[PDB]
Symmetry: C3
Subunit: 119 residues, 3 copies
């Protein structure tokens, strides 16, 4: 496969099951577009953290982590930072200035799938 991207959204917004699936599917479509990967290689998650807070406030906030073996560059990080923030702002009503995004580049010797390392 080479690279299987992952995107975990953590948020103190109590997202309904439907809104969660909507956000994750739009994020999955964005990741497939930017990283040029089929849906079968993409992992996504939304994790509700009731106690999370930003800026000393309990208002809506999202912390997004994107992890991938390849495709972690300035061009992709710029595009995905833009796309993911807009998706969350529209689907779960978080304000844009209440969205963090973190990009992590993993070595192929550090990642495994089906019990085998990527190389």
């Amino acid at each position: 496969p080479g690279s299987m991207p992952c995107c975990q959204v953590s948020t103190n917004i109590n997202v309904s099951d439907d809104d969660a699936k909507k956000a994750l599917m739009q994020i999955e479509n964005a990741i497939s577009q930017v990283m040029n990967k089929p849906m079968g290689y993409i992992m996504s998650n939304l994790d509700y953290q009731k106690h999370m807070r930003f800026g000393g406030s309990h208002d809506g906030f999202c912390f997004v982590r994107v992890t991938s073996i390849s495709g972690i560059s300035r061009s992709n990080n710029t595009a995905l930072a833009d796309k993911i923030t807009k998706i969350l702002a529209s689907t779960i009503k978080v304000k844009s200035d209440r969205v963090f995004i973190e990009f992590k580049d993993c070595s192929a010797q550090n990642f495994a799938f089906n019990g085998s390392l990527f190389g």
Copy 2:
């Protein structure tokens, strides 16, 4: 903004909502002091993991992660490792020898806020 510190505390202690907010605000104050950043830039969270266990035991345990673009030097890590452990021991009564802390230095091209990368 330069750097926006984050601190996520994971614990198998079923902490009450108020105790979680107190621990997070004391840790937020410690981060503001050591990393010299206003509260408006600091994120914190407490995450209850019922199944988490350490040393082959379910007794109280905390795994803390501190993530920041800057401020991840040995001098800051020593001070924050000391301060955070004392805060958790006092607020949720976890034993000091049952507290992990992990520090992560993030690249400004890998971090995003309000849809834009930091650097």
Copy 3:
């Protein structure tokens, strides 16, 4: 102590408390074998994420993260990638091709225990 390994398992499978402890103890035993560390230094967790999805599907899926200061070499990562995937496939009946594993090598100055940095 030198190195204190950690293994978090995230899964959309709603695992019973007993099955969760069963899996974690088998993984803890695997980590002790490969990294040659006594159980008193090993952390493990299982985290149920109802919204997690892989390949555009909600079918059973596990994302495993292994974190340690030492023992993050190709030889250890191969053995643990194989062992952990078999453990999860047997205990919670996740398919092997629905299991990610990520390995992270930590610096000893970035890790702390009992308020003191390791390096």
